[PDB]
Write an enzyme that holds these catalytic residues in place. Structure first.
Site, short mmCIF file in Angstrom:
data_model
loop_
_atom_site.label_atom_id
_atom_site.label_comp_id
_atom_site.label_asym_id
_atom_site.label_seq_id
_atom_site.Cartn_x
_atom_site.Cartn_y
_atom_site.Cartn_z
CG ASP A 25 -59.61 -7.74 -19.83
OD1 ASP A 25 -59.01 -8.78 -20.67
OD2 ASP A 25 -58.27 -6.91 -19.34
CB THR A 26 -62.15 -13.27 -20.54
OG1 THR A 26 -62.27 -12.83 -21.56
CG2 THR A 26 -63.30 -13.41 -19.55
N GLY A 27 -59.53 -11.47 -21.36
CA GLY A 27 -58.17 -12.29 -21.11
C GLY A 27 -56.99 -11.82 -20.90
#
Ligand SMILES: CC(C)[C@H](NC(=O)N(C)Cc1ccccn1)C(=O)N[C@@H](Cc1ccccc1)[C@H](O)[C@@H](O)[C@H](Cc1ccccc1)NC(=O)[C@@H](NC(=O)N(C)Cc1ccccn1)C(C)C
Lengths: 99, 99
Positions: A25-27
């Site tokens: 999860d890059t966010g």
């Protein structure tokens, strides 16, 4: 590896010799894992997201292995519906977004 | 480009003639932007994440441009903390995760 995003980017992690699955999860700034009882010292913390905040326990210096790649860092443990691998550990494995 | 994750993967998007910044988010199924007026009819929807559920408006077939690449797809508008670009539009622009 190159992971496409047609489906959710769920991969296998190892933590403490257990395998689990988790979302890359890059966010997320932080890593959040489903309730479990690790040994070690924790701090209480509140993390927020779309609908609000939940309470979690912060453990520092946890080693996780993500598709054979090691990373060491802070993990938050709490009533999350999904295991989330966030940027604090994704950076360690050399993970990039490309388009 | 190749984006590293030492900081938040915020980029500039263009939508409805505005410039905004938004987060490139592989853990989100959907795209959620802050409250704004778009042209079009919309349906109320609910979406969740950490913390719970929020109510949003769904706009279909919206043109958005993400670092100069166009995408046409569903955009949700509502009381999100941050503008989120999810997997429904990351796949359109050819985004992958690599390590
Ligand atoms: C895990 C938290 C520590 C994290 N918060 C966090 O990192 N911060 C608050 C700091 C911050 C501030 C500003 C910018 C960036 N980061 C978070 O929730 N991050 C979100 C994005 C976000 C950031 C800040 C505020 C609000 C949102 C994740 O990156 C995002 O991918 C989450 C991950 C997730 C998935 C399932 C359940 C909980 C959390 N998806 C979502 O919230 C989306 N939901 C889903 O995609 N689903 C529920 C579908 C689903 C179901 C099962 C599995 C996966 N996905 C929304 C946007 C529609």
């Amino acid at each position: 590896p190159q992971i496409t995003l047609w489906q959710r980017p769920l991969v296998t992690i190892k933590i403490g010799g257990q395998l689990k699955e988790a979302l890359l999860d890059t966010g997320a700034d932080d890593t959040v894992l489903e309730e479990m009882s690790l040994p070690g010292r924790w701090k209480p913390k509140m993390i927020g997201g779309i609908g609000g905040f939940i309470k979690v326990r912060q453990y520092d210096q946890i080693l996780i292995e993500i598709c054979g790649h090691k990373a060491i860092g802070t993990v938050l443990v709490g009533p999350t519906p999904v295991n989330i691998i966030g940027r604090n550990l994704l950076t360690q494995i050399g993970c990039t977004l490309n388009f």
